[PDB]
């Protein structure tokens, strides 16, 4: 790829610069290049990868929702194909980004990740990007896309429960996202609420073990679980 000639360390340095410049497409390209060097990623590097693609796909998803809403209102209205065409364009670009991320996870980040922190991180990302594919899916394969998200989240949950404390921020963000998966993808709002509550309560009971800085990190994510519970109940 286009980043094959750049040093791994230079790609990581430039990913950090792109983050500071809010140039997230560049950031994602640099981190894709770094992954393709073939070496495992550090905790910091995994976060750079996640931040870059989160922001890229987040813009695409927000645009897709705007266009989908316009398209829906047009199908209630004065009549052409332009709205559908442009929604499809954004959708296809979004699917391409999701496919690229899933391809990095499959070649070969997940299979080389042996530590719980790295393996859970990548399986959570796999669930997230199948979930984003599920958000726009409508055809023969929607159920398989949903089950791919579920399966990745479930394996991440199983490992995280066995190997990480209940306040671990990756464990908490995994549970947050699997809860949202249940609520709005799988049509299982009770499972979503149950998971958010049990996750919150088990984290609260472990806070006493933490330093001041870890306490801040954990309670930040616990508040997101609380926000969703307040929205859903």
């Amino acid at each position: 790829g286009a980043m094959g000639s750049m040093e791994r360390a230079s790609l990581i340095q430039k990913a950090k610069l792109a983050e500071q410049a809010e140039r997230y497409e560049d950031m994602a390209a640099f981190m894709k290049g770094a992954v393709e060097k073939g070496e495992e990623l550090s905790c910091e590097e995994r976060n750079l990868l996640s931040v870059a693609y989160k922001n890229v796909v987040g813009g695409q998803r927000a645009a897709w929702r705007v266009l989908s809403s316009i398209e829906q209102k047009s199908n209630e209205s004065e009549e052409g194909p332009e709205v559908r065409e442009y929604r499809e364009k954004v959708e296809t670009e979004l699917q391409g980004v999701c496919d690229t991320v899933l391809g990095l996870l499959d070649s070969h980040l997940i299979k080389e990740a042996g530590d719980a922190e790295s393996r859970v991180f990548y399986l959570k990302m796999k669930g997230d990007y199948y979930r984003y594919l599920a958000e726009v899916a409508t055809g023969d394969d929607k159920k398989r896309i949903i089950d791919s998200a579920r399966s990745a989240y479930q394996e991440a949950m199983d490992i995280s429960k066995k190997e990480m404390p209940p306040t671990n921020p990756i464990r908490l963000g995994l549970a947050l996202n699997f809860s949202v998966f249940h609520y709005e993808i799988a049509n299982s709002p009770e499972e979503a609420i149950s998971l958010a509550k049990t996750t919150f309560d088990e984290a609260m009971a472990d806070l006493h073990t933490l330093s001041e800085d870890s306490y801040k990190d954990s309670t930040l994510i616990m508040q997101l679980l609380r926000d969703n519970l307040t929205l859903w109940t």
Binding site: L176, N177, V180, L224, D227, N228, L231
Partner: peptide, 5 residues
Amino acid sequence: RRRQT
């Protein structure tokens, strides 16, 4: 509000 992830 939009749910959080």
